[PDB]
């Protein structure tokens, strides 16, 4: 059982490193964020440039979609987050309160809340309607690399360069759990679609799939290079069950979720592949890379 992603489109337009790429939940759009201070929207199936969204003062490190594909949230080195209305390009709110670069962000499923993580070592939960910060969690002792809500919004996972991965009760703000052999920086983390497992990446060229309730590592995936950058990893579940991640050898890696065999390496980028994302219904992968490449690529497979 094995995939065959082939290159279909290359999208260009960013003038600096592309920091994140993300499909709209409705499957129609691809958003990209960049150090060039911009967000760009592309048609998810044809890769056709849709529009540019501007307003951040400095580069953007992450960008994310509301549940209804109408809004987007971004986090910037200008210490703020901004909520965008897709259809109009408006900056509806500007979320202020972090004391250093905002690195990562996400809506909850209900999309009435946003979670953020920052170089200032905190995780914040914001009210989407009022733009006010509801809670500041003193989550880590080093910059916060990723944040993500589980399926029903009850839980938040964070990760940090301090080597910890932590689970938080959304309602109370309490730390319910802390994952722990060495303490290599944790560069990325994300719940599984069903909310039972946690995919985590560490700066020792390793991805691990955790059962977070039992606090035990169930799978480990290697072959890629990852010692420097906070690279996105994904579950691909529309066809075969894969793990998908970028890599510092300019290649997109695809593992079999069960066997942990590398089943495909997508070639064609000319710098570190920092971001990847999986389309929600079709077997379509998006990828994008750093300063020396700056292009976004779309790949499709029959499985």
């Amino acid at each position: 059982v094995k995939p065959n992603y082939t290159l279909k489109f290359t999208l260009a337009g960013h003038t600096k490193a592309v920091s994140a790429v993300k499909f709209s939940p409705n499957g129609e759009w691809l958003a990209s964020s960049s150090a060039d201070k911009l967000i760009k929207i592309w048609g998810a199936y044809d890769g056709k440039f849709e529009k540019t969204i501007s307003g951040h003062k400095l580069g953007i490190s992450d960008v994310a979609w509301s549940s209804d594909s109408r809004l987007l949230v971004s986090g910037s080195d200008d210490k703020t987050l901004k909520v965008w209305e897709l259809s109009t390009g408006k900056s509806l709110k500007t979320l202020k309160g972090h004391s250093n670069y905002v690195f990562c962000c996400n809506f909850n499923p209900q999309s009435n809340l946003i979670v953020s993580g920052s170089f200032d070592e905190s995780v914040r939960i914001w009210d989407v309607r009022t733009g006010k910060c509801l809670k500041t969690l003193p989550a880590h002792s080093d910059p916060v690399s990723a944040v993500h809500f589980n399926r029903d919004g009850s839980l938040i996972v964070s990760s940090s360069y301090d080597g910890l991965c932590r689970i938080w009760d959304t309602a109370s703000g309490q730390c319910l759990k802390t994952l722990i052999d060495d303490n290599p920086p944790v560069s990325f983390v994300k719940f599984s679609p069903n909310g039972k497992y946690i995919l985590a990446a560490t700066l020792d060229n390793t991805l691990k799939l955790w059962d977070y309730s039992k606090g035990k590592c169930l799978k480990t995936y290697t072959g890629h290079k990852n010692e420097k950058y906070c690279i996105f990893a994904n579950f691909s579940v529309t066809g075969g069950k894969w793990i998908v991640s970028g890599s510092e050898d300019n290649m997109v890696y695809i593992w079999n979720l069960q066997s942990k065999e590398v089943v495909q390496k997508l070639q064609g980028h000319t710098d570190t592949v920092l971001c990847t994302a999986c389309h929600p219904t079709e077997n379509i992968i998006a990828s994008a890379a750093l300063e020396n490449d700056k292009t976004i690529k779309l790949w499709k497979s029959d499985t």
Partner: peptide, 8 residues
């Protein structure tokens, strides 16, 4: 030993 990531 196979994990399901979609279903509850």
């Amino acid at each position: 030993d196979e994990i399901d990531v979609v279903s509850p």
